[PDB]
C-alpha cells in the first residue's frame, strides 16, 4: 500500500554476481581514453602496448 511504513514498503533488489572462469573474460570495464598529444616525447599506452 502507498501509505505503509518504510519497513513494509516494496524494495527492488538487483544482485550482481561476478565470477571468473577459465574462459576469456569478456565483460570488461570502460577504459577512459585521454587526449592525443603529438610531436613530444611521451609515454604511450596503446591497447596495452606501452
Amino acid at each position: 500500500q502507498p501509505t505503509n511504513g518504510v519497513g513494509y514498503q516494496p524494495y527492488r533488489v538487483v544482485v550482481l554476481s561476478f565470477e571468473l572462469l577459465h574462459a576469456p573474460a569478456t565483460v570488461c570495464g570502460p577504459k577512459k581514453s585521454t587526449n592525443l598529444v603529438k610531436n613530444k616525447c611521451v609515454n604511450f599506452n596503446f591497447n596495452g602496448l606501452t
Binding site: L21, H22, A23, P24, T26
Partner: protein, 47 residues
C-alpha cells in the same frame, strides 16, 4: 577461436588453382570451450 578468411575470384573448373593468397584475420571469438570435431553445413535444392 580465430577465423581467418579470404575470397578469391577463380575460373578453374575442377581442382584448386595454383597461386598465393594470404588469408586475412576476420574474427576472433571469446568462446573458452573445448572443440575436437566439426561438420560442414550445406543447403538443399528443392523442386
Amino acid at each position: 577461436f580465430k577465423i581467418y578468411s579470404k575470397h578469391t575470384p577463380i575460373n578453374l573448373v575442377r581442382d584448386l588453382p595454383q597461386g598465393f593468397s594470404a588469408l586475412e584475420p576476420l574474427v576472433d571469438l571469446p568462446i573458452g570451450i573445448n572443440i575436437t570435431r566439426f561438420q560442414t553445413l550445406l543447403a538443399l535444392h528443392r523442386s
